């Protein structure tokens, strides 16, 4: 079992300094740590601790003896030796010295294998790119226009990835990680033997144990000790450094950065050696300095350089707090740091946000983390009643205006106070919109108005909230169960008290294991007041991983009941109250979200083609407000929300409970310093304790806080008489100040006037936020006439800057998910490559990089085997033949390969049918020379796999070919099944069924064993049926590592399964060996399929042949969709050129036009007018009647019923087959269902954080026209064509290009092409089977509704 | 005789005096008009003050606040 | 008769004259209230004004006294009306 | 006698006037009671806040 | 004439009646004192606040 539940591949846990201190003091390892460094560990009776953990001391004593033997000078005390013992932040400028180059052969074999495999396809990849360029533009320089310099092929990419700096370091640390993880697995399994590894490289002595590694460099005479977490940290950082440096070397766009980045690293590295754990503060300043540099280029004089100067003064302060550098030295260092940020384009400057995670993370101590939240909380804070009432008055105004615009233009139930004037009474009576201009005046009546119950919210409205795992803290007693037993054992021995019971329970498991669970009774914890009298309540923080700033370094956990109440409250706020305000433009749909963001950023970009409109953007960071929220500033909002929801007291909970509990930071290796304080109530506000925190916690009650901030923003806008469009989200808000200027005015003067208008609103907003008690400093607020910040991406002059290096920094050589299959890792690499395409990096470079890194991963998995196999025949057959590696890596995933990135994916995010795109890509590779046609013939002639009727319907577009399902997904499914079969919750009573799988099979046979097989409709109907609802509920389970571990523990996997999970990668390689080795004898008619045959036809034939056993020759209809690249035969017209297609017969095309004179980052008047580009079109019915308030169970039934009729038939037998299926989830009669069913015509059949599809630099000036085209599959096809044309125009003028000296036209002819075909459907189909006996959960509310209609 | 008509003469004149007196009596009423109109404000400001003080007591962190209904 | 016609016409007259007299004073009390209430209106202004400008402070736990001691608050959610009610 | 009747008719008029004017005195009574009722509320709420304040 | 003689009888009775209700008008004085005392108490109470 231990061969699945492996140690983590990457960093997912915080770095604990005291863990390393524990492991080095436990073995008496040499060190120069001062007594104050050890903290609480210095007073521990280490002799007793060494008496226990006998195996760990044996290992640590052994490594100490070996350090003494190899280097005698370590015996010397008083630091009289020349060897220097250093900790993580101080080993930064030496990590290149550690080489281990000799006595290590696996990295060398890996590099040689990757080189040999890449050398066999680079020429073919280049030809593929050239053919794509010729068939999408008609000219061969589509991808090479911006760079023509050097055109890096896949061979060049591999060379520069393996010959760059940090390459040897990355190989060394990969070997160290591999050895250490082998050691951890061996120690778990209990071998007890040979668990020390001694490479003993010349000038680099490294000793590895399952607990720690000692690394000594003779050149610098420096020795360091690293724990496993810090080893993962170092290897991840170094892989990120390699990736960033390589990409900068390769991409001409990110070339000017390269040298600068390197310089920066060196400086900070040296600074680290001087500073230590504090150098990350400098790093956390740099993440702000980038924005300052952008603010250095704004037209307004009064707002130019303010942020730059202030951040420089903060960096000086940081460099001079410990007096490491004098003022002159600090000024130089600051100048060196800044000189790397100057003389760069705006997006290159924004591209410098990658380096935050290039220096690792700070070593975290519980006391230091607790100090920040102790200063933020538990602090006196003044608040202004007026500011609070005014914001409550505007809150009530927005809530009234939100109930309206909804609820049929009528006011919510409201009672008017005795002051309300005659005007407010009239407004209530006539149900009229409350004008913010009115609300600003009379606030003494807009507030003090109770919005009585308006919503019928139920705690059981959403089930997905209850079945997501959240960390739960132990009871107030047994709160030291988190700490290591060794440290607190002695303290309790001198206290004559029993040892604490360790806590491991999880919230999801506890819900699932409750015989009686009623959310109406769960909320009675809060409503009745029990939360204040509960003595077992305990909330504790725990150090947060992957954080470099002091704030946000800890996240909190609470008890089960208080976490359940919190999640219920958050769901209640999100479902009903949060929908009522839209003053903020943040939305759940990403498409409209980025549309609103682009319009906000392009408010002020008006061209020449009177009064004009001007915009000044203000972005404020909201990280530290959570700790600044007090009870006084949320009580009236909480009191009106409670009225609106009908509950007496649900909100207001976070603060009320926190005033009366002592919080603490929970780290197993960070016990309290005082061994006499062993109860939580008596604790003092020092060490790791935070006594009576008066503020809120991150995430908790965030909806109310965002709601109040929106109210304050609207208040400040109305006070200053200025129109704004806020974009408030959690932790960052952006406001686009709008003003009216003279059109004829100069651009600099226009923005000056905009800033002068924005000054009053900024002052009012500062005063308002200070009134509610959250002081705004220069750090948080950033004012620009050009850009704002949202979701860590900047919006600069109608564009979203690239920040591709940040994406490439997190591209490593394995995925953390338990399975650790090669498919998963290659999919992760492909996803990062798609992010790189979307982030401005050359698409040719992205495609070559994807091929190279898929090759790199498999080779790494082959040469670094995770699990030892008795037979190495498969791995030897793959290692000794790089041609097999290349063929398998270039093969598309849908066909059994690991190439998860398609050629069409380079341009459009939406794909449609993945197997048509895969066939296109394989054709391309075949015609170029990468793959051979016999591979395609083998794939066509491949023997059908082990597929069932449920497997075609659950996941359409998928072949009956084994091992396309990664082990990971299997592990998630097994965990979900184990937990639901164990679930006893009243809500999950009827959800689990022992006959679920065979019911799925029978229903899938009913929908699919027909005259025509239509897998899309089968998927929709299954997902809309009772069994599909049960599958969705079972899929709501989190399936987290810990959950997977639990599931494998309480429900042990059987032996064969155990083996098939353990050896999934080897079985997958063996299965693919049949198609990528030699030309297999196939059936003859397959000679008909050629590389010139349209993908769609090959996809139809492949689906017909792969599912031959299931379907017996019947064809599959409703899946095929043309590949976006093969459908369009584009042509780019420059100057005196003319379109060949148009001029030769063809007449269907999508016209794109980019004007002349567009100079970005310049005067908006000169360039042509800007507009929001086409970012896509999401779902956008006229049923015979519109039932409002329809339950989830009813809308589902009407869509199933409908698609059955639009698809299988319009008869009465067809109808007796939709009424029964809907009856599994509804109680409607035949007449009501029939009439309430939406129109069964043109069924869309659609079914199943902030990532922009492009920078929208030159796509905002483009003109689109489909007037010469026909135009819900066709709609998707034409949307894909438009997106492809947009991507082509964007890649024609890559981010290096900032000008257009000529006007370009794209025709993108889609007619005259093989892929387009007529669509015929809705033919009558009998069921060819009796209706299966569908077991329905009649009692269960979330599956069936006894009363769907009033 | 003639005296009587005179008596009536005075009778009427005096009656005419009541009128005069009554007049001032009446006018006084206007003062009222204003008092009622103003009292209106007195009530508006008073209530606002009442809400303010009431809210502050509600704000007290120490005592939990229940909202009727 | 005519005697009756005039003899009592006069007595009541006197009485009515008397009542009138009484009516007179009331009006003075009236003007006085008017002015008293005007002064009250001016006073109401300063109070409401000052209440508008008020400081609310959360003492917090700078001292660091144990919560046990800090527990000086009702644990009972109490229903009190605010604004309207 | 005719002159006497005229005088007689006249007082009637005067009477009418007495009646019409005094009725208005009754009218003045309306608000004075109403405002009296109003002020009553005030004296109440005033003391009401008294305890809260202390 | 004799008619008018009786005539004023009714109208003077009205006077009498009017004089009946008028007496009630005086009670207002009771309030005036109460409201005077109430504002004196409010000023004294605002004194505390100040
Ligand atoms: Zn054309
Ligand atoms: Zn085609």
From Swiss-Prot, chain A:
GO CC term (a single one): host cell cytoplasm
GO molecular-function terms, A-Z: ATP binding; hydrolase activity; mRNA 5'-cap (guanine-N7-)-methyltransferase activity; RNA-directed RNA polymerase activity
Chief localisation class: virion
Boundaries of every RdRp catalytic domain copy: 614-798
Chain residue ranges for the region called PRNTase: 871-1340
Coiled-coil zones: none
Alphabetic keyword roster: ATP-binding, Hydrolase, Methyltransferase, mRNA capping, mRNA processing, Multifunctional enzyme, Nucleotide-binding, Nucleotidyltransferase, RNA-directed RNA polymerase, S-adenosyl-L-methionine, Transferase, Viral RNA replication, Virion
Highest taxon above the source species: Viruses
Keyword check for Nucleotidyltransferase: yes
Compartments where found: Virion
Stated role: RNA-directed RNA polymerase that catalyzes the transcription of viral mRNAs, their capping and polyadenylation. The template is composed of the viral RNA tightly encapsidated by the nucleoprotein (N). The viral polymerase binds to the genomic RNA at the 3' leader promoter, and transcribes subsequently all viral mRNAs with a decreasing efficiency. The first gene is the most transcribed, and the last the least transcribed. The viral phosphoprotein acts as a processivity factor. Capping is concomitant with initiation of mRNA transcription.
UniProt similarity note: Belongs to the paramyxovirus L protein family.
Name of the protein in its database record: RNA-directed RNA polymerase L
Species of origin: Mumps virus genotype A (strain Jeryl-Lynn) (MuV)
Lineage, highest ranks first: Viruses, Riboviria, Orthornavirae, Negarnaviricota, Haploviricotina
Portion of the full sequence shown: 4 to 1415 of 2261
UniProtKB/Swiss-Prot annotation, chain D:
Residues recorded with modification Phosphothreonine: 33, 41
Region Multimerization, annotated ranges: 1-54
Phosphoserine modified-residue sites: 40
Subcellular location: Virion
Coiled coil (UniProt feature): 1-28
The protein's assembly and partners: Homotetramer. Interacts (via multimerization domain) with polymerase L; this interaction forms the polymerase L-P complex. Interacts (via N-terminus) with N0 (via Ncore); this interaction allows P to chaperon N0 to avoid N polymerization before encapsidation. Interacts (via C-terminus) with N-RNA template; this interaction positions the polymerase on the template for both transcription and replication. Interacts with host RPS6KB1 kinase; this interaction may play a role in the viral replication and transcription.
UniProt family annotation: Belongs to the rubulavirus/avulavirus P protein family.
Functional description taken from the UniProt entry: Essential cofactor of the RNA polymerase L that plays a central role in the transcription and replication by forming the polymerase complex with RNA polymerase L and recruiting L to the genomic N-RNA template for RNA synthesis. Also plays a central role in the encapsidation of nascent RNA chains by forming the encapsidation complex with the nucleocapsid protein N (N-P complex). Acts as a chaperone for newly synthesized free N protein, so-called N0, allowing encapsidation of nascent RNA chains during replication.
Domain remarks in the Swiss-Prot or TrEMBL record: The N-terminus consists of a long intrinsically disordered tail. The central part contains the coiled-coil multimerization domain (MD or OD). Forms a four-stranded coiled coil structure. The C-terminus constitutes the alpha-helical X domain (XD) that binds to the nucleocapsid (N-RNA complex) and the L polymerase.
Listed name of the protein: Phosphoprotein
Species of the source: Mumps virus genotype A (strain Jeryl-Lynn)
